[PDB]
Every structure is written in structure tokens, then in C-alpha cells.
Design a protein around this ligand. Structure first.
Ligand code: BCL
Ligand code: BCL
Ligand code: BCL
Ligand code: BCL
Ligand SMILES: CC[C@H]1c2cc3[nH]c4c(c3C)C(=O)[C@H](C(=O)OC)c4c3nc(cc4[nH]c(cc(n2)[C@@H]1C)c(C(C)=O)c4C)[C@@H](C)[C@@H]3CCC(=O)OC/C=C(\C)CCC[C@@H](C)CCC[C@@H](C)CCCC(C)C
Ligand SMILES: CC[C@H]1c2cc3[nH]c4c(c3C)C(=O)[C@H](C(=O)OC)c4c3nc(cc4[nH]c(cc(n2)[C@@H]1C)c(C(C)=O)c4C)[C@@H](C)[C@@H]3CCC(=O)OC/C=C(\C)CCC[C@@H](C)CCC[C@H](C)CCCC(C)C
Ligand SMILES: COC1=C(OC)C(=O)C(C/C=C(\C)CC/C=C(\C)CC/C=C(\C)CC/C=C(\C)CC/C=C(\C)CC/C=C(\C)CC/C=C(\C)CC/C=C(\C)CC/C=C(\C)CCC=C(C)C)=C(C)C1=O
Ligand SMILES: COC1=C(OC)C(=O)C(C/C=C(\C)CC/C=C(\C)CC/C=C(\C)CC/C=C(\C)CC/C=C(\C)CC/C=C(\C)CC/C=C(\C)CC/C=C(\C)CC/C=C(\C)CCC=C(C)C)=C(C)C1=O
Ligand SMILES: [Fe+2]
Lengths: 248, 281, 299
């Protein structure tokens, strides 16, 4: 019978296709390691696939995945039980050390590039032709932390040119320095932008950019690591829902 | 057990209930308090499923079925096997589901990401609860809900759907279907576009977002953008499930008849209602 | 914030696009910018490419809705109020069983249906040509063309391939909103319930599963958009904490994770298989299998 044969060979196909797909999602993070870094004994029922190579545009080189793992930078974390399956507590400060929810990856310390080879993200001063086209504009607003203290003053929006959107806010601190805040982590209100993740004292510790008119991919990842890290770690300093409206 | 980048994230913290007691991993899986609450409800629900298989007498997947309390039992409790066992498996499934999601909010918190996955998943939980709890209640009995069995629940859908004639005519069911269809089109388009720009014609460099905006603007005249397509995928998905649950909780409560008779409000509408011609003239 | 709607809209110069091998004479000018579309996605409308296939697709496509539209106006009696009250109830039906796969049907009894199906056939197949070529001109993979084939397959089987094997044009779907719902209903009814069709349950498995994986993927990216999650192509090429925290949520939740490249292979297949699986189930109906319940008892 044709229908019976059709459904039979379908499941043979779907088994080969789940096999294919899952080996393909083993191209990063695998082989599995034990908590100490040596290769783990249970490697899983699927085989790592044969290398794929990506050609990266404008002299960035290539990517051959899977490869030897790109982790190298010291991890400031110590084991909390003799046995496998337990937390690794920060040896220092998680915010500084780049750990836990403040983790960052050693991405290429070069800006993300656009279709033409120019920087994707650029401050809006220098992003020729860009302006705020709709909604409340945050340039100039006081910036507040979760301790409900004024952390800074927005002095420009960092714009993604090819995709035309607000990537970061640039914030002048108490000392006339600047930092970048991820836009999708700030909240633009009418008389203020509220950064919940960071209480004001932690704003200075936001990893800095070395060149003042570009962000590198390593810097972004360090910035976004540290701002998200404040949700668990700046929690002692965060005033609740109650004090936020009391705040007015 | 660990991925080659995983170690630096297995930091302590982000636990809703229970401190560090339950904050450990079992292989890849994270436990947490709601990990243990999801297992208790999972095992108990499947033990009580094996119990309806025995009280009914089969060990086959296609046949073992578990029924809701019949219409005489209304909304109150019922005897085990005569509907009552389903009632306890339903509580089991509900707490296993709400624990799975709450287990996810812990995982979000340890990782410092948005709460979007638990939130999207609550829509699924609420569509289940519509069919198993909220519409049963409005209609006055637990018997209006589906049975927990691979084929008998398909038999529940045919039978429930044909009590209103051709259920295609349900207007919110049309809206729901549209969202499932547009969602699968979108999924197809999003997967295909990203893979075409990462896996270009062999030899060439990997394409960029720019190219993607350019392929869709060239094809269709519009590009919603690499952020808009994730946003669109979330709203299509949840809109499907919202409207799907809305069309069932509107049925048997706000609407009793044949759903095809509903569209006569558009036709019996005065002014054009009595002109001969067309189909309804 | 959650990043469901943008907080601040930013506009620049109209982005005419990447050049590569695209024939730029065929590209049009910049459309308007909608602030309304800009709250959820890109603001810019256009430019679009209108090549030869582009125009052939658009002309046939319009000639198809012209053929459905005039039949409807004839059925409305050219009376506008009867049109708008029964837009939904109108239908351009196929030739009656008597005519087989002949074109000899009269205009009002299936000729207009066939002209409408010729116009739709050409329109959809030239747009598929266009889906391939616009990718070639940008040097992109041909994934969108292959994906569109799954969708075209269910279309082809329902209105062409299954009517031809069945000997009759009356077998195909009528052109009407309500009438095609009644066709679908009726199709399961005369095939002895399509819930027993193994490929229909499989189609539903992937339809459901498409809303499951895109609420999952959609929600994962929005949840790591704080680490520039949506810029999935640079994450493939140079992994970031967004791709890491994304994959780890799912490794810690259901025990297995993916990749920023690989989640889109899950996504294209999960969706391709809806209509690819479904198309088989309709082709097998009426031709090999006459009643899915009956068939199901011999399994
Ligand atoms: C699958 C089983 C049955 C069936 C069962 C049902 C059922 C059951 C229901 C429907 C419903 C619908 N069906 Mg059906 N339907 C069938 C076959 C078809 C065929 C066909 C040719 O194959 C078509 C066109 C349709 C079409 C339709 C829609 C009219 C309607 C809404 C869903 C939708 O399309 O998703 C939406 C898809 C999109 C939104 C794609 C649009 C993409 C756009 C927005 C992208 C932008 C670009 C665009 C404007 C073009 C760009 C070029 C520029 C203009 C220059 N059906 C088969 C026979 N169908 C629902 C309904 O409401 O019925 C009244 C419904 O309940
Ligand atoms: C009483 C009715 C029967 C029934 C009869 C049918 C029939 C009959 C068919 C299905 C099919 C399907 N059914 Mg059913 N189905 C039933 C009950 C269900 C239930 C349920 C909960 O009860 C569910 C979830 C479903 C779900 C589904 C889908 C899985 C599947 C359609 C896939 C799809 O995405 O197609 C949508 C995709 C397309 C139509 C492809 C579109 C192609 C392109 C080329 C269109 C171009 C359009 C262009 C010309 C216009 C553009 C407009 C502009 C943008 C404006 N059915 C009951 C039991 N079902 C279909 C199937 O595949 O069967 C297995 C099918 O034919
Ligand atoms: C013959 C029957 C009638 C009909 C009768 C009905 C009836 C009756 C109902 C529907 C419902 C639906 N119908 Mg219908 N429908 C018909 C024809 C169609 C056609 C079609 C093309 O013809 C389509 C596309 C649809 C489409 C739809 C969907 C919109 C909707 C189902 C989705 C949903 O509820 O999601 C919701 C998703 C869930 C409920 C999933 C919940 C999951 C939970 C939270 C988690 C489970 C976890 C799991 C156990 C964990 C185990 C892990 C494993 C061990 C790995 N129908 C015909 C005409 N339809 C249903 C609806 O509206 O429901 C609200 C419904 O009740
Ligand atoms: C939404 C409208 C109706 C409905 C209408 C239909 C229709 C119509 C069809 C199905 C089909 C299925 N339904 Mg249903 N179904 C409903 C509610 C449910 C619930 C629930 C807890 O609410 C569950 C678990 C299921 C589960 C199932 C699957 C067994 C099957 C394939 C679906 C799929 O892959 O989904 C997508 C989700 C995934 C890919 C995630 C994977 C989930 C796996 C498949 C779950 C295995 C569950 C196992 C059999 C039961 C768990 C018991 C254990 C003891 C834990 N349905 C409601 C009442 N369902 C199809 C079928 O019967 O064909 C086989 C089918 O045609
Ligand atoms: C894997 C299966 C899923 C899928 C996939 C899918 N669909 C696809 C693709 C893919 C992968 C495409 O690449 C192709 C596409 O290009 O996407 C937008 C497409 C497509 N899927 C579509 C529809 C569609 N897909 C469906 C379903 C599905 N598609 C499945 C869920 C459904 C249903 C019923 O669920 C529908 C209705 C089309 C939008 C599109 C292909 C368009 C096409 O072939 O149409 C030719 C017809 C015309 C050109 C008619 C023109 C109509 C006029 C009124 C336009 C007038 C415009 C004017 C007023 C303004 C502009 C003027 C200009 C000069 C600027
Ligand atoms: C926005 C809604 C869409 C959606 C989203 C969604 N589903 C999700 C998520 C999201 C965002 C998850 O995060 C979560 C996940 O981890 O994904 C892999 C999940 C999930 N969605 C699932 C299934 C699922 N989703 C469905 C639908 C949808 N999910 C919608 C389309 C369906 C359908 C259409 O039928 C199913 C079957 C699970 C695979 C998964 C995890 C859910 C979970 O809570 O897992 C814990 C499971 C247990 C502990 C087992 C408990 C059950 C036992 C006690 C048995 C009792 C009940 C019995 C089985 C009744 C049903 C029998 C049937 C034959 C009728
Ligand atoms: C790599 O990347 C990629 C890109 O990029 C580079 C791309 O470009 C693209 C290309 C993709 C595209 C161009 C887009 C593709 C698009 C489609 C496939 C289809 C498009 C579909 C649509 C546009 C449909 C969406 C619907 C619209 C626009 C209509 C309006 C919205 C809805 C119907 C949805 C919301 C639901 C509504 C409005 C119904 C009612 C809702 C409810 C009752 C629930 C809400 C609750 C309440 C109302 C309760 C009460 C609360 C109140 C009242 C709130 C208080 C507010 C008051 C006002 C009082 C791809 C694929 C891609 O891969
Ligand atoms: C960009 O970002 C993103 C990612 O990141 C980069 C992602 O990843 C993802 C995630 C998406 C995917 C990975 C895609 C695939 C997923 C789907 C299409 C959804 C469907 C998924 C399911 C149905 C799985 C549901 C799983 C559940 C509910 C959990 C399972 C629960 C148990 C097993 C019991 C609980 C167990 C505990 C507590 C511990 C015990 C440990 C074990 C049992 C582990 C041992 C496992 C094995 C030895 C391997 C098993 C091998 C199998 C099953 C073989 C496969 C079968 C074949 C037939 C070939 C998204 C969305 C994303 O956007
Ligand atoms: Fe994506």
C-alpha cells in the first residue's frame, strides 16, 4: 500500500533530519567538558559534524566551526562542592570579573561592520542624516539608577546606520566622562530615562570604549554583560515599586 | 556535562523560592525549587494516568484515555474512574506547567536575560486552561473539557466542532487560523533569510543584515528588520493562541447555535438586507 | 523595558541598498516612511525591484483577482450593496464533473474558474522565479526559493495535481471565502475524516510546532536583545554572550540547546514540513486512499 509506505519512509526521513539538525547545533559549545575543563566522558549520542568554513567580509578572515574553543580569559569563580553539579561562586566581584550574569565573551575587538565596510554603530552626531523621527527624545534627560539617584545625563543616541535604530544611549557621568547604555535596558520616561539594572554608584564601573566614536564588539559585549549583571548584583541597592512612585 | 562556554554562568543565585538548597544542576538540566515541584507534579500525573489505564483495562497508547466528569457530575467533585481521576490529573498537569514556566523565570534570572520565554509559554498554559477549566466553568460542567488520550481527544474536537455545524465559520477561529498560517509563513521566511545570508552561494563571503533588508525590500518592497521579525514571530504565535482560546471560550456560552448562522447579522443588516440578487437575496 | 515596541524612533537617509549584481535600473525609488510601522519594525517602505518576472507576476496576479472580482460582480448583479453584503458568500466554482480535465466548459459554468486558475498558476510560479533570482543577484543562498516550494506544493496538489490524477476539474477548490471553507469541510467528510489521515496529524504537528518554535525563538532573541541578540549573523560569525545565554537557557531548561546559525535550520524545517507533509496527505486522499478511517483500521 502506497500511503503506508509513504508514512513509513517519512519517519525514516524525520529521524535522519532530527539527526542532521542536532549535529548542526553542535557546531559551538561542544565537545562537552567536565567542570574542570578536561573532556567529559558522556559525549552524547550524536557525532560532532565535519568543519564548515565561513568567509568573513572586509578582512575579518574566516570561521571554522567546530574548532578549538575560543575561551581563554581568566574566569574568577571557585567550585562550591566536591561533586559535579554545583554552583561556582565568584572569587571576587562578579561585575568586575565578567562572571555570571555579568559574563561577556571575548568577541573580536573591532566594530561590527555594515554592507559597505563602515561601522554599523556610530554616535548620532556623526551619523549623517540621522535624527529622532518619533517618540520622546532622551538626549539631554537626567538618567536615574535603581537607588533612585541621578546617575548621569544622556548626551547622544548611538545609532545603527544600516538598520536605522537606537542601539545605545551615551551617558555623561558626574565627572564629565561617558558611557554606553544598551537601549533595550533603559526606559525613556518623559522627564527622565530610568536604568533599573544599575544603581548610580555602579555607573562608573561600566566598561569604557577606547576610541570615542566607535564601539568594538568586545566592548559591547563587555558593556551589555555588566549592565545585565546588575539585575542580580545591584539588587541590595534597588528600591522597590513602592519607593519609585513615592519618588514623585 | 558542561558546554565549553557554560562554566562562567553556573554562578549561584536567581532563585524565586528556596535560597541555595535547590540551586544545583542534574547534568544539563537546572533543578531549582520549581524543578522539584515540576517533577512531583509530573510523576504524580503519569502514575494517576497509569491508574486510568488499569481501571479501564488497556496498556496501549492509542486506547488509554481518561475521561472528564460526565454532565451529571456538573462542576463539583466526582468519583475516581467516573471522571474524578481526570480531575486530579488536571490539577497535576496545571501545577507541572506553571512550575515549568516558573522554573524558567529562575533560569532567566540566573542568566540576566528577559522573562520572555515564560511569558510566551503562559499563553499556551492559558489556552489549555481555557479548554480544561475556564470554559467548563462557564458552561456549568467538567464534562465539556477534552479527554486525555491521543485519539479520543481528536474525537473530542470533531464532536465539539460539529455541534456548531462547520466550526470554520467561527469568526475568532478564522482569526486564529490566520495567525497560525501567517506565523508558519513568517517562520519559513525568517529561517530561510538568515540561512541564505549565512550560507550564501558557495565561494562568497557571508552576507550581512543589509543584504537581508535588501532581499526583502527587493522581493516584497518591505523589510521589517532583524528585530521586527522576532517581535513579529512572538506576536503571531501568541496572537494565534490568544484568538484560538478566545473562539472556544465564546462558544457554548455566548453562542450555542450553528456558527454559520452568526454571519446573518451582516446580511439581515437593514438597507441592503432586502434587495433581491446575490446569494442571500 | 521589554523591546516589544521601540521606545525612540531614529531615522536616516533612505537606504537604497546593497548593490552586488542587482540590476539597479530595475530598482524603484524610495517609498514613504511610516512612523506606525516604525514602532514595531523598520520604518522605510521600499525600494522594490520590478524586473520582467516581477511585472509578469504582478499582471497575472492582478488578472486572477480581476477574474474572481468580475464573476462576483456578475453574481452581485452589478449592484454595489449586494456585492458588499455577500462578498463572502460569492464563489467561482470549477467545471462540473461532466467536463473532466477538458477546457470546454461554458464561461459561467467553470470557464472563468479555469481562466482564474491559469492566471494564478503563472502569477505564483513567476513569483517563485523571482524569489530565486533576487537571491542570486545578491549572491545569497536559495533558501527562500526552496521554502516557497513547500508552500507551492500544497497549493499545487489542492488545485492542479490532485484534480489531474482524479480525472476532473470539479475536484479543485472554488474561489470564494466561505465556499473554500465548505470545500475543506466537505473534503474531510467525503474522505472519511481527515483526523485519521497520518499526514494531516503530522501537518498539524508542524503547524502547532511552528507557533511553538517561533514564540520560543522570537522570545529568546527579544530576551537577549540586551546583548545585541537580534544581530544573529554576527553572532554566527563571532559568538557573543547573547548566543551563549540564549543557548544556555534552553540547555538548562529542556536539556539541549542550539546555535545561532542552527536555530534557523530548525525554524525553516519546522515550517517547511507543514505543507510538505500536508501536501502528501491531500495527494494520497481520493487517489490511493478513499477513506482514512478504513485505511486506519488496516494499520
Ligand atoms: C489549508 C486547507 C484549505 C484552507 C482552509 C482555510 C481555513 C480553515 C481558514 C482559511 C483561511 C484563509 N485562507 Mg485558506 N485554505 C486552503 C487554501 C487557500 C489558498 C490557496 C490558493 O491555497 C489561499 C490563498 C487561501 C487563503 C486564505 C485566506 C483568504 C484566509 C486567511 C489565512 C491566510 O491566508 O494566511 C495569511 C497569510 C498572509 C498574511 C500572507 C501575506 C503576506 C504579506 C502580509 C506580506 C507583504 C507583501 C504582500 C502584500 C505582496 C507584496 C508585493 C507588493 C504589493 C508590491 N486558502 C485549503 C483549501 N483557509 C481562514 C479564513 O479566515 O477564512 C475565511 C480560515 O479560517
Ligand atoms: C472539517 C475540516 C477538516 C480539515 C480539513 C483539511 C483539509 C481539506 C486540508 C487541511 C489541511 C490542514 N489542516 Mg485541517 N481539517 C480539520 C481540522 C484541523 C485542525 C483542527 C484543530 O481540528 C487543525 C489544526 C488543522 C490544521 C491543518 C493544517 C495543518 C493543514 C494546512 C496547512 C497550511 O498551513 O496550509 C496553508 C498553506 C497553503 C494553502 C499554501 C499557500 C500557497 C501559496 C502559493 C499561495 C499564494 C496566494 C496568492 C495567490 C494570494 C496572495 C495574497 C496577498 C498577500 C494579499 N485542521 C477538519 C478535520 N485540513 C490541508 C492539508 O495540508 O491537509 C493535510 C488541507 O488541504
Ligand atoms: C472537525 C472540527 C472542526 C474544528 C474544531 C475545533 C475545536 C473544537 C477546537 C479547535 C481548535 C483549534 N482549531 Mg479547529 N476545527 C476545524 C478545522 C480547523 C482548521 C482547518 C484548516 O480546517 C484549522 C487550521 C483549525 C485550527 C484550530 C486552532 C486555531 C485551534 C487549535 C490551536 C490551539 O488551541 O492551541 C492551544 C494550544 C494548547 C492548548 C497546547 C497546551 C500545551 C500545554 C501547555 C503543554 C503540554 C506539555 C506536554 C504535555 C509536555 C510533554 C513533553 C513531552 C513528554 C516531550 N481548525 C474543524 C472544522 N478546532 C481548539 C481551540 O480553539 O482551542 C483553544 C479547539 O478547542
Ligand atoms: C489544540 C486543540 C486540541 C488538540 C488538537 C489536536 C489535533 C487536531 C491534532 C493533535 C495532535 C497532537 N496533540 Mg493535541 N490538542 C489539544 C491539546 C493537547 C495537549 C494538551 C496538554 O493540551 C497535548 C499534550 C496534546 C498533544 C498532542 C500530540 C500527541 C499530537 C501532536 C501535536 C504536536 O506535536 O504539537 C506540537 C508540539 C510539539 C512538536 C512539542 C512536542 C510535544 C509532544 C509531541 C507531546 C507528546 C505527548 C504524549 C503523547 C502525551 C504526554 C503524556 C505523558 C505521560 C507526559 N494536544 C487540544 C484539545 N492535537 C495531532 C495528532 O493527534 O496526531 C498525532 C493532531 O492531528
Ligand atoms: C512553508 C509553508 C508556509 C509558506 C511559505 C512561504 N510563502 C511564501 C514564501 C514562503 C517560504 C515566499 O518566499 C513567498 C514570499 O515572497 O513571501 C512574502 C511566499 C508567499 N506566500 C504567500 C501567501 C500565502 N502563503 C501561505 C502559507 C504558507 N506559506 C505556509 C505557512 C498562505 C496561507 C493561505 O496560509 C498564503 C495566503 C504570498 C504572499 C507570497 C507569494 C506571492 C505570489 O506568488 O503572489 C503573486 C500574486 C500577486 C503578485 C498578486 C498581486 C495582488 C495585487 C492586489 C497587488 C497590488 C499592489 C499595489 C496596490 C501596491 C504596490 C505597487 C508597487 C508598484 C510598489
Ligand atoms: C505561545 C503558544 C505556543 C507555545 C509556546 C511554548 N511552548 C513551550 C514554551 C513556549 C514559549 C516553552 O518554554 C516550553 C518549552 O520548554 O519548550 C520546549 C514549551 C512547551 N510546550 C510544549 C508542548 C506543546 N505546546 C503546544 C503549543 C504551543 N506552545 C503554542 C503554539 C502544544 C500543542 C499545540 O499541542 C504542545 C503539545 C512542551 C513540549 C514544552 C514544555 C511544557 C512543560 O510544562 O513541560 C513540562 C512537562 C511535564 C513535567 C509533563 C507533565 C504532564 C504530565 C503531568 C501528564 C498530564 C497531562 C496530559 C499529558 C494531558 C494531555 C494528553 C494529550 C494526548 C491530549
Ligand atoms: C532576518 O530578518 C528578517 C527581516 O529583516 C531583515 C525581514 O524583513 C523579513 C521579512 C519579513 C517581513 C517583511 C514581514 C513578514 C510579514 C508577514 C509574513 C505577514 C504580516 C502580517 C501582519 C502585518 C499582520 C499583523 C496584524 C496587524 C498589522 C493588525 C493589527 C494588529 C493585530 C490584529 C494583532 C493584535 C491583536 C488585536 C489588535 C486584536 C485585539 C486584541 C485583544 C482583545 C488583546 C489585548 C488585550 C486587551 C485589548 C485588553 C484591554 C486592554 C486595553 C484596552 C489597553 C489600554 C489601551 C487603550 C487604548 C484603552 C524576514 C522574514 C526576516 O527574517
Ligand atoms: C537563538 O537562540 C535560541 C537557541 O539558542 C542558540 C535555542 O537553543 C533555542 C531552542 C530551540 C531548539 C533547541 C530547537 C528544537 C526544539 C523544538 C522544536 C521544541 C520541541 C522540543 C521538545 C518537545 C523537547 C521538550 C523537552 C522537555 C519537556 C524536557 C525533557 C525532560 C526530561 C527528559 C525529564 C526531566 C529530566 C531531568 C530533571 C534530568 C535527567 C536528565 C536527562 C533525561 C538527560 C539525558 C539525555 C540524553 C542521554 C539524550 C537523549 C537522546 C535522544 C532523546 C535521542 C533523539 C531521538 C531520536 C529518535 C534521534 C531557541 C528557541 C533559540 O531561540
Ligand atoms: Fe532569528
Amino acid at each position: 500500500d502506497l500511503a503506508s509506505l509513504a508514512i513509513y519512509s517519512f519517519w525514516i526521513f524525520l529521524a535522519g533530519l532530527i539527526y542532521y539538525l542536532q549535529t548542526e547545533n553542535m557546531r559551538e559549545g561542544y565537545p562537552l567538558e567536565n567542570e574542570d575543563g578536561t573532556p567529559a566522558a558522556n559525549q552524547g549520542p550524536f557525532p560532532l559534524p565535519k568543519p564548515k568554513t565561513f568567509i568573513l567580509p572586509h578582512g575579518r578572515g574566516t570561521l571554522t566551526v567546530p574548532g578549538p574553543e575560543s575561551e581563554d580569559r581568566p574566569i574568577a569563580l571557585a567550585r562550591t562542592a566536591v561533586s559535579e553539579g554545583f554552583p561556582h561562586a565568584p572569587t571576587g566581584d562578579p561585575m568586575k570579573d565578567g562572571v555570571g550574569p555579568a559574563s561577556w565573551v571575548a568577541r573580536r575587538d573591532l566594530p561590527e561592520l555594515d554592507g559597505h565596510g563602515h561601522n554599523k554603530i556610530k554616535p548620532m552626531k556623526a551619523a549623517a542624516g540621522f535624527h529622532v523621527s518619533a517618540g520622546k527624545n532622551p538626549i539631554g534627560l537626567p538618567v536615574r539608577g535603581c537607588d533612585l539617584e541621578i546617575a548621569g545625563k544622556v548626551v547622544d543616541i548611538w545609532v545603527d546606520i544600516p538598520e536605522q535604530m537606537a542601539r545605545f544611549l551615551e551617558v555623561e557621568l558626574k565627572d564629565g566622562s561617558t558611557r554606553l547604555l544598551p537601549m533595550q535596558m533603559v526606559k525613556v520616561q518623559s522627564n527622565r530615562v530610568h536604568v533599573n539594572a544599575l544603581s548610580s554608584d555602579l555607573f562608573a564601573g561600566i566598561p569604557t570604549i577606547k576610541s570615542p566614536t566607535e564601539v568594538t564588539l568586545l566592548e559591547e559585549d563587555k558593556i551589555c554583560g555588566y549592565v545585565a549583571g546588575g539585575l542580580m548584583y545591584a539588587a541590595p541597592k534597588r528600591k522597590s515599586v513602592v519607593a519609585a512612585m513615592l519618588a514623585e | 556535562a558542561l558546554l565549553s562556554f557554560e562554566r562562567k554562568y553556573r554562578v549561584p543565585g536567581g532563585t524565586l523560592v528556596g535560597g541555595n538548597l535547590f540551586d544545583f544542576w542534574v547534568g544539563p538540566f537546572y533543578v531549582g525549587f520549581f524543578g522539584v515541584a515540576t517533577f512531583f507534579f509530573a510523576a504524580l500525573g503519569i502514575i494517576l494516568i497509569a491508574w486510568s489505564a488499569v481501571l479501564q483495562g488497556t496498556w496501549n497508547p492509542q486506547l488509554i484515555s481518561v475521561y472528564p466528569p460526565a454532565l451529571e457530575y456538573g462542576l463539583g467533585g466526582a468519583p475516581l474512574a467516573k471522571g474524578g481521576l481526570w480531575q486530579i490529573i488536571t490539577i497535576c498537569a496545571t501545577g507541572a506547567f506553571v512550575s515549568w514556566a516558573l522554573r524558567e523565570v529562575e533560569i532567566c534570572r540566573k542568566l540576566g536575560i528577559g522573562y520572555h520565554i515564560p511569558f510566551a509559554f503562559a499563553f499556551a498554559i492559558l489556552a489549555y486552561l481555557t479548554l480544561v477549566l475556564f470554559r467548563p466553568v462557564m458552561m456549568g460542567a467538567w464534562g465539556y473539557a477534552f479527554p486525555y488520550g491521543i485519539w479520543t481527544h481528536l474525537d473530542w474536537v470533531s464532536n465539539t466542532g460539529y455541534t456548531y455545524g462547520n466550526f470554520h465559520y467561527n469568526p475568532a477561529h478564522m482569526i486564529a487560523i490566520s495567525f497560525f498560517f501567517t506565523n508558519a509563513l513568517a517562520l519559513a521566511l525568517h529561517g530561510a533569510l538568515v540561512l541564505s545570508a549565512a550560507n550564501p552561494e558557495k565561494g562568497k563571503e557571508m552576507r550581512t543584515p543589509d543584504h537581508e533588508d535588501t532581499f526583502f525590500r527587493d522581493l516584497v518592497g518591505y523589510s521589517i528588520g532583524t528585530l521586527g521579525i522576532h517581535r513579529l514571530g512572538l506576536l503571531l504565535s501568541l496572537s494565534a493562541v490568544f484568538f484560538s482560546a478566545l473562539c472556544m471560550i465564546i462558544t457554548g456560552t455566548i453562542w450555542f447555535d450553528q456558527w454559520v448562522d452568526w454571519w446573518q447579522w451582516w446580511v439581515k443588516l437593514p438597507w441592503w438586507a432586502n434587495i433581491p440578487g446575490g446569494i442571500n437575496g | 523595558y521589554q523591546n516589544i515596541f521601540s521606545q525612540v524612533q531614529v531615522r536616516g537617509p533612505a537606504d537604497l541598498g546593497m548593490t552586488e549584481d542587482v540590476n539597479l535600473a530595475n530598482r524603484s525609488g524610495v517609498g514613504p516612511f511610516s512612523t506606525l510601522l516604525g514602532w514595531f519594525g523598520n520604518a522605510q517602505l521600499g525600494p522594490i525591484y520590478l524586473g520582467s518576472l516581477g511585472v509578469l507576476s504582478l499582471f497575472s496576479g492582478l488578472m486572477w483577482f480581476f477574474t474572481i472580482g468580475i464573476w462576483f460582480w456578475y453574481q452581485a448583479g452589478w449592484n454595489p450593496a449586494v456585492f458588499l453584503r455577500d462578498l463572502f458568500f460569492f464563489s467561482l466554482e470549477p467545471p462540473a464533473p461532466e467536463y473532466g480535465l477538458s477546457f470546454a466548459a461554458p464561461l459561467k459554468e467553470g470557464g472563468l474558474w479555469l481562466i482564474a486558475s491559469f492566471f494564478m498558476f503563472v502569477a505564483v510560479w513567476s513569483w517563485w522565479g523571482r524569489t530565486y533570482l533576487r537571491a542570486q543577484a545578491l549572491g545569497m543562498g536559495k533558501h527562500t526559493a526552496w521554502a516557497f516550494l513547500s508552500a507551492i506544493w500544497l497549493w499545487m496538489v489542492l488545485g492542479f495535481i490532485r484534480p489531474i490524477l482524479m480525472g476532473s476539474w470539479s475536484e479543485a477548490v472554488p474561489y470564494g471565502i466561505f465556499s473554500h471553507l465548505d470545500w475543506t469541510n466537505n473534503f474531510s467528510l467525503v474522505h472519511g475524516n481527515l483526523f485519521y489521515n497520518p499526514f494531516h496529524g503530522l501537518s498539524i504537528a508542524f503547524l502547532y510546532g511552528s507557533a511553538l518554535l517561533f514564540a520560543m525563538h522570537g522570545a529568546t532573541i527579544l530576551a537577549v536583545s540586551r546583548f545585541g541578540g537580534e544581530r544573529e549573523l554576527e553572532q554566527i560569525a563571532d559568538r557573543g554572550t547573547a548566543a551563549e545565554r540564549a543557548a544556555l537557557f534552553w540547555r538548562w531548561t529542556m536539556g539541549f540547546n542550539a546555535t545561532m546559525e542552527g536555530i534557523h535550520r530548525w525554524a525553516i524545517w519546522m515550517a517547511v514540513l507543514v505543507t510538505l507533509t500536508g501536501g502528501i496527505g491531500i495527494l494520497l486522499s481520493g487517489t490511493v486512499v478513499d477513506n482514512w478511517y478504513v485505511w486506519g483500521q488496516n494499520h
